[PDB]
Design an enzyme around this catalytic site. Structure first.
Site, short mmCIF file in Angstrom:
data_model
loop_
_atom_site.label_atom_id
_atom_site.label_comp_id
_atom_site.label_asym_id
_atom_site.label_seq_id
_atom_site.Cartn_x
_atom_site.Cartn_y
_atom_site.Cartn_z
N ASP A 1 0.92 -1.11 0.12
CA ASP A 1 0.00 -0.22 -0.03
C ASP A 1 0.80 1.25 -0.03
OD1 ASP A 1 -1.78 2.08 0.29
OD2 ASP A 1 -2.95 1.05 2.26
N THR A 2 1.10 1.65 -1.37
CA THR A 2 2.08 2.84 -1.37
C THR A 2 1.45 4.10 -0.88
OG1 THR A 2 1.37 3.14 -3.44
CG2 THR A 2 3.32 1.72 -3.22
N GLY A 3 0.15 4.17 -0.67
CA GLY A 3 -0.42 5.31 -0.01
C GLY A 3 -0.48 5.23 1.55
C1 LIG Z 1 -8.57 -0.66 2.54
C2 LIG Z 1 -7.10 -0.57 1.75
C3 LIG Z 1 -6.68 0.81 2.12
C4 LIG Z 1 -6.65 1.45 3.62
C5 LIG Z 1 -7.35 1.82 1.18
N1 LIG Z 1 -7.04 3.20 0.97
C6 LIG Z 1 -5.85 3.67 0.58
C7 LIG Z 1 -4.57 3.98 1.32
O1 LIG Z 1 -3.48 4.04 0.51
C8 LIG Z 1 -4.91 4.85 2.25
C9 LIG Z 1 -4.78 6.38 1.68
C10 LIG Z 1 -4.85 7.42 2.54
C11 LIG Z 1 -3.45 8.39 2.57
C12 LIG Z 1 -3.55 9.49 3.46
C13 LIG Z 1 -4.87 9.93 4.27
C14 LIG Z 1 -6.11 8.99 4.07
C15 LIG Z 1 -6.01 8.00 3.14
N2 LIG Z 1 -3.84 5.12 3.30
C16 LIG Z 1 -3.96 4.78 4.73
O2 LIG Z 1 -4.85 4.85 5.03
O3 LIG Z 1 -2.56 5.00 5.32
C17 LIG Z 1 -2.79 4.82 6.91
C18 LIG Z 1 -2.06 4.08 7.46
O4 LIG Z 1 -0.51 4.93 7.05
C19 LIG Z 1 -0.88 6.26 7.45
O5 LIG Z 1 -0.39 7.12 6.31
C20 LIG Z 1 -1.47 7.52 5.28
C21 LIG Z 1 -2.66 7.38 6.10
C22 LIG Z 1 -2.40 6.26 7.45
S1 LIG Z 1 -8.29 4.50 1.19
O6 LIG Z 1 -7.67 5.74 1.06
O7 LIG Z 1 -8.93 4.28 2.48
C23 LIG Z 1 -9.25 4.03 -0.19
C24 LIG Z 1 -8.92 4.48 -1.61
C25 LIG Z 1 -9.88 4.25 -2.58
C26 LIG Z 1 -11.00 3.55 -2.32
C27 LIG Z 1 -12.00 3.20 -3.65
O8 LIG Z 1 -11.49 2.06 -4.18
C28 LIG Z 1 -11.35 2.90 -1.20
C29 LIG Z 1 -10.58 3.14 0.04
#
Ligand SMILES: CC[C@H](C)CN(C[C@@H](O)[C@H](Cc1ccccc1)NC(=O)O[C@H]1CO[C@H]2OCC[C@H]21)S(=O)(=O)c1ccc(CO)cc1
Lengths: 99, 99
Positions: free
Chosen positions: A25-27
């Site tokens: 999960d690069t995000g």
């Molecule tokens: C269910 C699998 C993941 C949680 C999905 N997420 C993408 C994820 O990359 C999010 C994307 C993301 C990035 C920043 C802020 C909010 C969401 N990152 C994230 O939640 O990371 C958390 C854990 O490490 C912390 O750094 C980032 C937030 C913390 S998401 O944002 O919730 C999401 C994106 C797109 C859809 C539609 O397909 C549904 C859900």
């Protein structure tokens, strides 16, 4: 390996002696795993996502093998919808994005 | 190019004649962008992650340019804390994970 993104980049991880499936999960800045038993001192922490903040247990300096590549870093345990491997560990296994 | 993951994988995108910044997010099935008043019809949708769900507007067949790479697919618009390019468009630019 090279992983295409037509499917979820799910891989098998080894943490605390047991296997698990997790999402590369690069995000994600950080690594968040679903509720589980882990040996090691933990501290209560909070992490925010797309829908708000959750309470997690922060385990520092945990061993975790991701798709055959070893890492040692912070692991957050809490009610995440799915096990996600974040950049704190992706960097350790030498993971990059390429296009 | 090759993008390391020491920092967030932020890139400039072009959508609806506007430039924005977004994350190349292998953990996102679909692309989610901040509130923007796009033309055309849309279908309501709810998407979940850490913290719960947010309500978004689903637009289909939206043209997006990502580092000069053109793509066309679904874009979800809503009160997301961050703009993420999901796998539905990352596949269209030839993006892979590599370690
Ligand atoms: C269910 C699998 C993941 C949680 C999905 N997420 C993408 C994820 O990359 C999010 C994307 C993301 C990035 C920043 C802020 C909010 C969401 N990152 C994230 O939640 O990371 C958390 C854990 O490490 C912390 O750094 C980032 C937030 C913390 S998401 O944002 O919730 C999401 C994106 C797109 C859809 C539609 O397909 C549904 C859900």
């Amino acid at each position: 390996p090279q992983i295409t993104l037509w499917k979820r980049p799910l891989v098998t991880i080894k943490i605390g002696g047991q296997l698990k499936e997790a999402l590369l999960d690069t995000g994600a800045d950080d690594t968040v795993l679903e509720e589980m038993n882990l040996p090691g001192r933990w501290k209560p922490k909070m992490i925010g996502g797309i829908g708000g903040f959750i309470k997690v247990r922060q385990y520092d300096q945990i061993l975790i093998e991701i798709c055959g590549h070893k890492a040692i870093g912070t692991v957050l345990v809490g009610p995440t919808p799915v096990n996600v491997i974040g950049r704190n560990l992706l960097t350790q296994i030498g993971c990059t994005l390429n296009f």
